[PDB]
Amino acid sequence: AECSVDIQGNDQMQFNTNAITVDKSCKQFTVNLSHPGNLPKNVMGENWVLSTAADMQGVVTDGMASGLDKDYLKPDDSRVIAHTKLIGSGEKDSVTFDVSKLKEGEQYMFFCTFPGHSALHKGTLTLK
Numbered sequence: 001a002e003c004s005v006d007i008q009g010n011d012q013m014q015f016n017t018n019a020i021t022v023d024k025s026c027k028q029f030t031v032n033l034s035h036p037g038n039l040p041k042n043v044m045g046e047n048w049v050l051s052t053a054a055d056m057q058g059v060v061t062d063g064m065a066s067g068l069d070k071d072y073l074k075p076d077d078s079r080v081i082a083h084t085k086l087i088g089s090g091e092k093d094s095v096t097f098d099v100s101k102l103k104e105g106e107q108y109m110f111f112c113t114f115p116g117h118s119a120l121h122k123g124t125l126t127l128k
């Protein structure tokens with residue numbers, strides 16, 4: 001099975017997937033994120049951050065408090081299962097993580113932690 005996804009977006013900052021299924025037979029999984037816009041990361045930063053659905057609010061809130069210089073993630077946040085760098089126009093990043101960190105049946109969310117974005121830039125992730 002495929003163990004990679006490419007996440008891409010609009011000129012209007014709309015992204016092309018809101019649900020990711022990680023196949024159980026994957027040993028690693030890769031997310032490729034690319035920025036579709038014209039603005040730099042301090043104005044329109046994008047990242048892809050994975051946590052349990054339960055942890056998403058805490059990660060987002062603490063990330064906002066941490067600020068741009070920390071890519072809007074609290075340092076040493078063990079709630080974060082995997083994530084990309086915060087990227088801006090013309091940039092891309094990839095993250096590969098260990099699928100053994102996921103549990104079948106647990107509910108996961110991926111989201112952007114740039115302030116205010118997570119209500120729009122988010123989706124589910126499932127190990128199946």
Ligand SMILES: [Cu+2]
Nearest residue numbers: 046112117121
């Ligand atoms: Cu965003």
Ligand SMILES: [Cu+2]
Nearest residue numbers: 073080082083
């Ligand atoms: Cu990190």
